[PDB]
Design a protein around this ligand. Structure first.
Ligand SMILES: Nc1nc2c(ncn2[C@@H]2O[C@H](COP(=O)(O)OP(=O)(O)OP(=O)(O)O)[C@@H](O)[C@H]2O)c(=O)[nH]1
Ligand SMILES: [Mg+2]
Ligand code: NA
Lengths: 357, 432, 9
């Protein structure tokens, strides 16, 4: 479950932590920043002897230069210039690229101190699982693995099925529902998924559902009504009432209902929302923001002005009891946010456009 | 005898499949021994009155549910014409198949139910009398016959008060879509009992209009877009022994002849056409109108599927890497923005396509550039937008090949909007 | 609703 976070020094500039789930790697991605110095025990090749090298394990302190996280890998990938290490190896000033894993102890220091909000966020990662969602119709089968922080399409097949007039059409759909069910069970195992939601129009999803319950009785299985199969059907299921209850703890899913609420407001009541980093920050100072939906790449934007501005807004909205939802740009909600500068906000009251400083 | 493709559309269980079932049995094409064999099995399951429907409906789900799911193709002929009749699904979950059927149709029979609640459910906001009329219109069906079915029912009983009332509400709605409301026959029929299908019904002497067969012969044949490239959107792909892999589809434009080498886009697979079959008739060529099976040496079952379009190598079908389009937003819960990815239904294809830009908003009743790069579109708006297909899609400009360039936007088990394609940034033609 | 839209249909 949640990350062991433990402030060390008097000034609260140093923190010592150990990620214990993939959500804890995500929390590190949204939290860490170019300038923080991590202290990890890694290995590094060093020239010892004559025309010879040894992989010798050592402790390094690294001024972070790069924080990247690919979902479903169990790897927060970090890089930067080594600011401290053993003096004979001559590594000071050199680039060390490596990967924080689950179980990796790392101490990390921020020059201007860690906030109480930053730590609370860092300790919020109640290790939520990783569901699988699939969608089945007569044309298409897709399957995806869904975390709070990521979605990945693991299968996307066309059921190149006979026309219903064809003999052996009935056995060909049977093979196809086996191939589908098999693949669901395969990936629920490979990802340790408790729930497996199965979308689609009509009975194919139930035929597939029965096959997976047979092969995994411990696994929970939800059948959701949906207009079509494939990746569209998976993405359709994410917006249904059924799935928002069953997977209510997943940002990715959470995001779609605020996005829907934000867009329902942009039509009628334009002044009860804001978007774009600066306008969000403006209304955040006012204490206007109820929830803020954010693309995670804004936290790491190469422009210093917007990383400080986005952090200020996020810090402000949570200082006045607002919610902050951070998601990958590579996701069905994330894709709609590009035209709004990566950020959207729901406001508690109308704020006129000429009042937004 | 000229050939025409007839599609059957209407709300769930308004009686499409029984109409086509019984209409064939009266015109001669269904065997007595078969019809009663279906009646027995129908009766053996809790499905007594689906005997005529089971001529068309065949799948495990279709028979269990008593629901048409995918298109059933059948053949008959009247005095003047020979028909490919295409029984399409009513249920909302399968309107994507209704669209593939509608894209092939030269005309349509709109089966509406005169029963209480059923007409109203058909014509409500989220009904399919309404939606299939919308979709049929946008896919190019200009000719239309309407069959006010279920006249015999206990809660109607051959009533004129109902017939006049249901025709009134349809006439108001169809004239919005821009149909020739005085020029189309509204036939009060019973698909189950067989009234007005072939011979006049004694039970409706007040009628004085054409019967279904007499209305079929009323229909004029379509024009033939020959002197255009070859376009055959595939419907299905079979592996029939004695032939190999045989795609089936309607020819929209051009002329397919035996021996022609053909390419299937988007896959880029090339195949020699070995034979052409239509209603089990050997053809040496097919032309606009013809719904044919055509064997192909070289291509396998795994290489091609529904939504793929066949053409000559001379000018293969355009694979849209991106495409521009004018659209009109019918319904949307919130608001359409850059990033939105509804399913684009063109010809036989149904492919998600991301809106990568909204170039301009337009006035729905006139259509001039009101705004430029608007932040959103909502229900009632019309606009110019740029799509990027999530997977390879074949589209063509509406000016060039209108039947490959007219489309519906669907999302969330609803029709969001409709549109035509005004430009296409083509993809890299990647032949094997 | 208001649906009187022709694209040359
Ligand atoms: N009384 C009466 N019942 C009818 C008539 N036509 C159809 N039905 C009944 O309506 C039900 C459905 O008939 P279908 O022909 O399957 O309807 P459908 O529109 O083809 O169904 P979908 O294609 O799935 O929408 C059956 O129980 C039929 O007995 C009719 O003319 N009169
Ligand atoms: Mg039917
Ligand atoms: Na039916």
């Amino acid at each position: 479950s949640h990350m062991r976070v433990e402030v060390l020094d008097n000034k609260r500039r140093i923190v010592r932590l150990r990620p214990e789930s993939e959500e804890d790697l995500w929390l590190l991605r949204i939290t860490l920043r170019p300038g923080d110095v991590v202290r990890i025990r890694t290995s590094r090749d060093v020239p010892v002897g004559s025309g010879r090298k040894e992989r010798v394990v050592m402790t390094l302190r690294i001024r972070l230069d790069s924080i990247e996280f690919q979902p479903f890998t169990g790897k927060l990938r970090i890089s930067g210039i080594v600011v401290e290490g053993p003096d004979e190896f001559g590594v000071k000033g050199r680039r060390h690229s490596t990967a924080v894993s689950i179980g990796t102890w790392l101490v990390v220091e921020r020059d201007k101190g860690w906030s109480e909000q930053e730590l609370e966020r860092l300790a919020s990662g109640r290790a939520r699982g990783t569901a699988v969602i699939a969608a089945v119709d007569y044309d298409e089968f897709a399957l995806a693995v869904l975390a709070g922080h990521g979605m990945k399409i693991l299968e996307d097949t066309s059921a190149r099925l006979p026309g219903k007039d064809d003999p052996s059409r009935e056995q060909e759909v049977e093979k196809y529902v086996d191939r589908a069910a098999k693949r669901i069970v395969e990936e629920a195992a490979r990802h340790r998924s408790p729930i497996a939601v199965i979308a689609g129009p009509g009975q194919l999803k139930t035929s597939v559902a029965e096959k997976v319950q047979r092969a995994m009785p411990s696994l929970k299985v939800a059948t959701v009504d949906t207009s079509m199969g494939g990746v569209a059907g998976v993405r359709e299921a994410l917006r249904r009432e059924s799935v928002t209850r069953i997977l209510r703890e997943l940002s990715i899913v959470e995001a779609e209902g605020v996005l829907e609420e934000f867009l329902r407001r942009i039509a009628k009541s334009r002044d009860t929302v804001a978007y774009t980093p600066g306008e969000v920050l403006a209304v955040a100072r006012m204490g206007a923001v109820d929830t803020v939906l954010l693309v995670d790449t804004l936290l790491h934007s190469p422009d210093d002005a917007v990383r400080e501005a986005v952090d200020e807004a996020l810090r402000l909205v949570e200082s006045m009891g607002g919610r902050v939802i951070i998601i990958p740009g590579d996701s069905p909600a994330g894709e709609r946010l590009v035209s709004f500068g990566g950020v959207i906000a729901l406001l508690r009251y109308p704020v006129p456009q000429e009042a937004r400083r | 005898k000229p050939h025409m493709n007839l599609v059957v559309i209407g709300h769930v269980d308004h009686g499409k499949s029984t109409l086509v079932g019984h209409l064939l049995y009266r015109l001669g094409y269904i065997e007595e021994k078969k019809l009663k064999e279906l009646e027995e099995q129908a009766k053996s399951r809790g499905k007594e009155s689906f005997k005529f429907a089971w001529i068309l409906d065949k799948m495990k789900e279709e028979r269990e549910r008593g629901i048409t799911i995918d298109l059933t193709f059948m053949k008959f002929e009247t005095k003047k014409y020979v028909f490919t009749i295409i029984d399409a699904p009513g249920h909302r979950d399968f309107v994507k198949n209704m669209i593939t059927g509608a894209s092939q149709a030269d005309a349509a029979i709109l089966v509406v139910s005169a029963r209480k609640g059923e007409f109203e459910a058909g014509m409500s906001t989220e009904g399919q009398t309404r939606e299939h009329l919308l979709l049929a219109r946008t896919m190019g069906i200009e000719q239309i016959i309407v069959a006010v079915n279920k006249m015999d029912a206990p809660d109607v009983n051959y009533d004129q008060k109902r017939y006049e009332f249901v025709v009134s509400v349809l006439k108001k709605f169809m004239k919005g879509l821009g149909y020739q409301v005085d020029k189309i026959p509204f036939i009060p029929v019973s698909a189950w009992k067989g009234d007005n299908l072939i011979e006049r019904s004694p039970n409706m002497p007040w009628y004085n209009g054409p019967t279904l067969v007499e209305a079929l012969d009323q229909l004029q044949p379509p024009a033939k877009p020959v002197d255009k490239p070859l376009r055959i959107p595939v419907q299905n792909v079979y592996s029939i022994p004695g032939a190999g892999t045989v795609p089936v589809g309607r020819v929209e434009t051009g002329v397919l002849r035996v021996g022609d080498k053909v390419v299937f886009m988007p896959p880029g697979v090339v195949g020699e056409v070995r034979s052409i079959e239509m209603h089990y008739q050997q053809l040496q060529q097919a032309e606009p109108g013809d719904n044919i099976g055509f064997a192909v040496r070289g291509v396998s079952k795994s290489d091609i599927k529904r939504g793929d379009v066949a053409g000559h190598l001379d000018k293969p079908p355009t694979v849209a890497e991106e495409f521009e389009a004018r659209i009109f937003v019918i319904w949307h819960p919130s608001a359409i923005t850059v990033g939105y990815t509804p399913v684009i239904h063109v010809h036989t294809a149904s492919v998600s396509s991301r809106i990568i830009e909204i170039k301009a908003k337009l006035d729905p009743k006139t259509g001039q550039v009101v705004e430029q790069n608007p932040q959103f579109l909502k229900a009632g708006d019309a606009a110019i937008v740029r799509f990027k297909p999530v997977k390879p899609l074949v589209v063509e400009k509406f000016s060039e090949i209108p039947q490959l360039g007219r489309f519906a936007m669907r999302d969330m088990n609803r029709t969001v909007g409709i549109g035509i394609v005004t430009d296409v940034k083509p993809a890299k033609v990647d032949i094997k | 609703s208001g649906l009187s839209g022709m694209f040359g249909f």
